[model samples]
Target: QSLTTALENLLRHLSQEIPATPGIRVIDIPFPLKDAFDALSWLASQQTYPQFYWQQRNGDEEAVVLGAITRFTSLDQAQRFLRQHPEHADLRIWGLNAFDPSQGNLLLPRLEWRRCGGKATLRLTLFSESSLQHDAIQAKEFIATLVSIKPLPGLHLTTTREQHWPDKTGWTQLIELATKTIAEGELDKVVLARATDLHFASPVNAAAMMAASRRLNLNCYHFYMAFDGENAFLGSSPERLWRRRDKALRTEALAGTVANNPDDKQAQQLGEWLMADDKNQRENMLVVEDICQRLQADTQTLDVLPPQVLRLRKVQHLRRCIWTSLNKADDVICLHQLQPTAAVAGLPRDLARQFIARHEPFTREWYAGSAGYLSLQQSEFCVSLRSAKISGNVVRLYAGAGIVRGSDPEQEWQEIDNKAAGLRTLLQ
Candidate 1:
């Protein structure tokens, strides 16, 4: 029998087993495609419900977990639900302001389908007042159709017409302010960000951009999340904010970046230069110290390794890996403690935030926030760097650089340019 015929039979069997009231149903299916990008592309196109794409660093853990809003609640309630019911791995996608006391958090997609490795698991989440029987048959057919179709090339999503941002004058002024602030002892270092607005010929395809990013950026976490059909958040990032597996935890200090050279000899020379540069190393040290200090309270034992060069497609950065064994229980709560680190914020986090608010041209909603999943066993989140926000035909790309006392405005501008160039290249 053809693949479609077999898939149809399986769908029929799964559909018949659905319960009447709100509940969850898990079904395992044989899947042919191994690439997570292909799976996401197929899933995003088929569902009007929001979708989430996550590819782990080094390609070690890859999954395109997609779902729609089933219910919304406070982060505390979500955590409580997870703790009480240890059996189900409830997946959540949150924004940067998720922990804001006044605003509250978000959890969605009454249902989800996680595609990983060579298999796909359909997680049917039915909320109160939701029809389990109706959603089950719909989900089964969606999975069957996804499995049967062949992966196709991504469609042309956008055409860049004009690019503008913290134009030269504004960047120069901000740099001067940051340097003066550092010299005055207000901040050790501040990560200054530049937001570039790209006016496109047409509305951008979120899935297409995500698929294109994977080809050029490897050894990084590639992700995409669209809450509303008009707005989509997507990127390929190399920074890990924090990841917890039981009592063991991992985080990294990534700072001080230089352009990646195409030539082997030239790249090595750049790496050595950055490694030896006092300004870059100092910036990296500040990051390492801040991260270690934050994790010290919760860790029984914490190890901070020597700094090394993390080479990527368009750039290289100084990275220090830190691991710890939590003295107390661990969960995504630690994310709030460590996030908006010195890399994205500044050395004195509070002061740095003030500086950013005054200097930055735009509001960073989820631009430099965290994105990942929390399961019953563990949780992992990546720094939402190297990312862009898509709203209809307009695309805004965000990138930043650490500004220390000796930092040059022109050079800092160039760093953000190189960072933004990566996204622009993938989109074009």
Candidate 2:
């Protein structure tokens, strides 16, 4: 049957069959060749519901989901709700505030329209207090309209400039403070972040930014979350906070940094130096060791892959993948324990957080947090590094470097320059 016909039939079934009691209806159909970003942008433009876009590395998993069949304001509430209904595919987004468990405002969208892999699915959620006729009619119209939406053509964003938050001089001073604290044996490593502003000639196009980024970084997770018409958070990042498939759980220790050179031999030489350099090696190991230590109790046996170089378009980093079988536990339980990992926050997490609070100039928001989807079958979250925050013509870009005892203020600043280079190209 045709996509439209199938959706029409599904809506017919939902309208006639299920009684309204906070239930979900999911339908999967073949994927399309059009741009996913365009469709997502269309969703945001409709102003009907909030839109969420998430894609894993090529061949991993990809999906564009929107519509709030329901909404949960707290992580605990969302967890309990998802656990109650273990059969539906749900989308969850957490802010950096989640790092502090007490400040919980993790948002989960209900009854979303999802297009994953080679198929599209409509997850219709209705509450017990819902009006059956109203929900059924809305589902039918929503799906039918979604199927008809067309992709936008040749979209682009023009650029201008602005610099917000602490200036470079300010960053240099903070770096000095961090290195001094590290030298004093207060912490082994602290990852410090900086934010800069970019202005556009026209309103920022979230979809255009996402589509442009996809061409540059094919190996990273491409994500866009626009809660309203004016604000959006999007990026393509190579760091994986965690991914779960059935009983097996996986996470990565990604740290250390080196710029990629166009000359193959030059890049190779840098890679070699990165592998042998004591400072970068120390930076990478702090992350790997922290992951191993944190997961020891809940995992059956940890498999630590030897450190390898992860080369991105603008830079390279030392990465180690950790895989193990998980004991029975909520994914959030693991997220709470592992997050603000040494890779993003710092070693001896608390002290590093203190240092960041007292020194860094701006709030991190979801930039250094995590973004991904969770479902009954599996879950994956990518560290929100290498990301940009967009609101109208202004874009706030963020990048961070791991600061150790040997870190130099000048070199660290250059590292962030290299890190931000990927998205900077899109703006230009």
Candidate 3:
């Protein structure tokens, strides 16, 4: 099929599938990764464009969980959808809107086009009721119908360790800042972040970088977004902060620290090392508690587990997963109540953000914010960690760790460096 016809067909199908309404928004991103580095550089250089980002950690090297740039309409309906369909969401929702410029919201922007190389490809992603197989087929048919863009070739750059911050001090600083912010009342919870340096040769190919990331075989999600036309040019994000399945809402909470080489054969051995250390357990547990507290008012069924070890491709660290059934409440309340959880915000939630505002260098432009998709029926969102702020010539990669009293500034520094390990390798 011709590119134009294929695109037309995909759009027709999309328009047909979704109920058209006022707050109803349709987004189409075309060949966004075309010039990955260029895109990154452009994203980083600009401070004004509306954007949303998220990161999902599956293992050492997480998927590009998310690297989106765009603005989103007010989250009013998105919040309403969360409220009306509290029991109906099959996925979780996390994202940004002009209203919650800081990092709080239940609504997520949807994507109509993910890949449109040579062919004018168009695809629709549903955050609700989708079997992996069924969704793949639909995506293929929709995208295949469009004309493919000749693959663009660029330099093979390297994401290296040179940019890693010395330790967890910065992370702790961010956590503390958020904690304090809540206390000070500038904003209940504000996500704070910083980028590590990544130097790579010019002319990087988007496909190759994507392929390498995919090979990691982690559940890391990949996203490609672009916008134009009558469609609101609001940016796009590709990450799953958390999801609710069978009435269970889940968020991946991470904290603690680990060495790059724990040559120990047992991951638990490393975890034991982490746990025995009072500091590690403190940070990790705080995140777990904060999430449960946020949901405590709305949930009758809640399970907040102890922290354990979860490994990624090249890295392993402490993590906690909180699972609960949300009571029927306003989606905005659910979303607002738990954002910038202790994972990103420091322990004793309220005080952490306070330090972030006073200590952090830059205002969080969605670094640890949540990003995902939303439908009146249901929604999904992912914390925007392990993410990148991109622009035309500069790309700033970011990673953070949790900090608590007794935390070693130098060790925290190393863990943040370790967090960048996968991205560094992928850049090469």
Candidate 4:
């Protein structure tokens, strides 16, 4: 991973200026530190896919629903609907609250709402019209609403950092256990993880967190949620299942694992060596290939990028970014793209999904599903990772890794623990 300087520069470039377009809605801001959640409220209400959540193992910090008018019948309905559609179907369903359409259906309606982070003390209103053009009358209303939000109050935060895990022996033990598990066939692959702790001086720093994540050159984005005061849900995710904006559908298929270090020589060598690891590459490829076959009939163009090694924190991982925009005919099949993807599910998509359905300890819920905004003209979705469910005083974290023939369940388990390290660092 590069130093913070490179990340700072990238941030400046990314947020340089919002694109200007007719009938287009674009909002970009320096991640707010203390009042970050407020921004999430505004985004959820304004975007087309109006929903936000902070998920963990047991439950969520809180769940919000904006502009939702009806219930989605049942889980089977959600999954079946996705199964029927090959291009853009997503089996996942949300537990949003109810909304009153007439008074102002603009706010992402909450059909049902729940949370544990804190009381639902914040709220935002949605715009009546879908797209507000420049110089148009609705534009004035949009601008006015934008100005109505209260300025965020500076918040005090507790943070810490751990320069090194300093436990090579633990990793050693895990590797050995994983080797045995793979031989017995209990698991195909598992991820291992470790972390450093930190105590921050401010309530929370969105820009800083994004900047820190960017320094790693990893495919990442910050999750901003405004539930309690203005807490920011953050992550540098490298996986994408699918996204639907009107008739167009897209997704980034990433899987496989490796390790990273700060030293240039070791890091470079590590990256090269990681790329040469056929076992990791094969598992990662199986995921993308499965996704492609699932949606093959729905699109005229299916673009797949060759796998490459990615460096994040002190580790490197093999990844592939997939992109595809569906045609009208394919729209019906788009949401299914989210079903047990190879990254989260397994190879032979259908079989893997069935296996997970019967074996996983608890319901998967939104754990491996896509999360983001879906608007009329534009939309963005991300695989949920480096995440936790913050309730009362407990934050339940979730993470999983692919298991292959040479994979170690114990090591994979450790990798997942490392994946959950970020949240614990914040908690410190």
Q: Model 1: C-alpha RMSD to truth?
A: 3.6
lDDT of 3 at 186: 48
Give the per-residue lDDT of model 4 (tens digit) for 143-223.
333222233333235433323232456545655654565567645544333333333443453423433433443445444
Q: What lDDT would each prediction earn against the true structure?
A: 0.70, 0.70, 0.46, 0.44
Best by TM-score: 2
Q: Which residue runs of candidate 1 sit more than 4 Å off their true CA positions?
A: 1-23, 30-37, 69-77, 89-120, 126-163
Considering summed lDDT, which 10 consecutive residues are worst modelled in model 4? 96-105
TM-score of every model versus the real structure: 0.85, 0.86, 0.60, 0.54
- In model 2, the worst 10-residue window by lDDT is 93-102
194-223: candidate 2 lDDT, tens digit per residue: 888888788887766777777678688887
Better candidate by lDDT, 1 or 3: 1
Write one digit per residue (lDDT tens) for candidate 3, span 1-428: 23345355555555444432222222333433333322222222222223222223332211111212123344455554455444444322334432132333332323222222332223334433434334434444534433333443334664433343423565666555445545555444333445665444443333344445545535555432212111111112223356654356776557666643446566556657876788667656756667777778888877767776765545556777677777752445545776656667654555556656566665555566655555444445555555554343234566665543334445655665666665556555
After TM-score superposition, what is the CA distance of residue 300 in candidate 3 from its true location, in Å?
1.3
Residue 286 error for model 4, in Å?
1.4
Off by over 4 Å in 2: 1-3, 20-24, 27-45, 87-122, 130-134, 141-161, 261-273
Candidate 3 worst ten-residue window by lDDT: 226-235
lDDT of 1 by residue, 1-428 (tens): 23344356556656575666765544444444443335566556655556677777877555555454443344445456656555655444333223121122345443344555455554444433466677666766555445333464565655666565688899999999999989998677788888888878777777788888888898888878876677888888899988777778889888887888889778889999999999789878877889888777778777888888988887888998998888755454566678777778886888998888877887777788777766556777788888888998888989888888699999988877877888888765
Candidate structures ordered by TM-score, highest first? 2, 1, 3, 4
What's the CA RMSD of model 2 in angstroms?
3.4
